[PDB]
Amino acid sequence: INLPGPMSLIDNTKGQLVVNPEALKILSAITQPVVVVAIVGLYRTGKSYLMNKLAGKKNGFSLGSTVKSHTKGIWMWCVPHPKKPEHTLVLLDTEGLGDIEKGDNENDSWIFALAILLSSTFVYNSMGTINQQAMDQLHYVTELTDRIKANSSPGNNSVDDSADFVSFFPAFVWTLRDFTLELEVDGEPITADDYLELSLKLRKGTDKKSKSFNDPRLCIRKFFPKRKCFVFDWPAPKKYLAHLEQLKEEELNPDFIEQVAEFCSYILSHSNVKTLSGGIPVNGPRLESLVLTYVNAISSGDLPC
Numbered sequence: 001i002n003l004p005g006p007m008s009l010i011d012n013t014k015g016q017l018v019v020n021p022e023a024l025k026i027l028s029a030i031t032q033p034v035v036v037v038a039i040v041g042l043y044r045t046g047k048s049y050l051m052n053k054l055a056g057k058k059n060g061f062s063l064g065s066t067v068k069s070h071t072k073g074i075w076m077w078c079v080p081h082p083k084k085p086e087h088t089l090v091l092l093d094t095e096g097l098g099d100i101e102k103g104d105n106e107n108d109s110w111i112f113a114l115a116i117l118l119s120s121t122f123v124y125n126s127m128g129t130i131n132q133q134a135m136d137q138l139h140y141v142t143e144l145t146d147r148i149k150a151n152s153s154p155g156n157n158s159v160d161d162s163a164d165f166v167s168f169f170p171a172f173v174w175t176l177r178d179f180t181l182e183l184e185v186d187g188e189p190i191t192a193d194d195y196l197e198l199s200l201k202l203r204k205g206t207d208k209k210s211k212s213f214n215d216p217r218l219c220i221r222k223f224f225p226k227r228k229c230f231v232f233d234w235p236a237p238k239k240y241l242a243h244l245e246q247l248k249e250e251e252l253n254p255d256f257i258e259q260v261a262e263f264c265s266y267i268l269s270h271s272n273v274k275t276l277s278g279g280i281p282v283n284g285p286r287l288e289s290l291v292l293t294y295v296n297a298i299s300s301g302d303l304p305c
């Protein structure tokens with residue numbers, strides 16, 4: 001109808017971070033309540049492919065093919081909510097997450113915390129089994145988000161252990177890609193949610209370097225008390241992964257088809273209308289005011305995030 005295709009919301013393509021006045025203009029005109037889904041993860045891990053499946057439209061995001069490996073940004077695509085009439089689904093696709101283990105450039109990395117704080121549901125996307133690097137990566141953006149939260153008006157006086165925090169801050173979904181691991185414990189099979197809870201399991205009482213072990217896991221667990229995990233096989237034999245989008249659905253792996261259907265159905269039925277601290281529903285212009293408020297507080301701010 002009137003909602004256009006993906007556009008930059010904020011990126012650093014040409015020098016420094018710039019907010020796209022055209023993206024605010026689009027948000028300003030979205031009078032309907034919005035459901036906001038943000039996705040964060042390393043370059044070319046299939047983030048855009050998955051967000052395009054949520055939108056159910058052609059000509060969606062292609063960040064892995066058109067953004068350079070060093071750019072950071074948030075890209076926005078608003079569509080009618082595929083399952084909730086008179087609701088708009090706001091898709092926030094991001095790029096430029098750095099690998100902390102390799103000392104990747106962290107300048108402007110606060111925009112990934114921004115994407116999380118704008119979201120109804122935050123999707124963290126990584127390849128393979130849950131390993132130390134993926135955990136450390138998640139821990140970094142969680143600490144950054146908590147820092148920005150603790151120090152800005154939208155998040156002020158909303159302690160992580162309260163019920164307001166649990167209810168009105170973003171739900172969390174970890175998507176694991178090219179995942180071939182057997183979801184088994186002692187011959188007995190376990191779910192992907194089970195796998196995630198196991199990876200976040202706390203050492204019970206253990207203390208010398210056991211309560212050091214719990215610290216990053218407790219940070220994640222308490223910042224994201226609403227958690228879900230989805231696993232995705234290779235989409236298709238590697239031969240064909242160059243341009244997955246061009247493949248016909250019947251040429252995908254059948255388990256991948258089911259795994260994408262499951263993810264999409266969960267997100268589109270379970271992600272709530274974005275809400276402020278306190279429960280106030282958020283619509284287009286209200287989201288735009290959140291963007292402005294955060295960007296100004298972080299720009300004008302004194303301390304590092």
Ligand SMILES: Nc1nc2c(ncn2[C@@H]2O[C@H](COP(=O)(O)OP(=O)(O)O)[C@@H](O)[C@H]2O)c(=O)[nH]1
Nearest residue numbers: 043044045046047048049063064065241242244
């Ligand atoms: N191996 C693998 N490749 C994928 C998957 N999804 C997409 N790709 C390919 O990975 C590349 C980058 O995709 P894109 O979605 O743009 O990645 P983004 O950077 O994370 O957004 C493309 O060539 C895709 O065809 C996946 O699940 N597994």
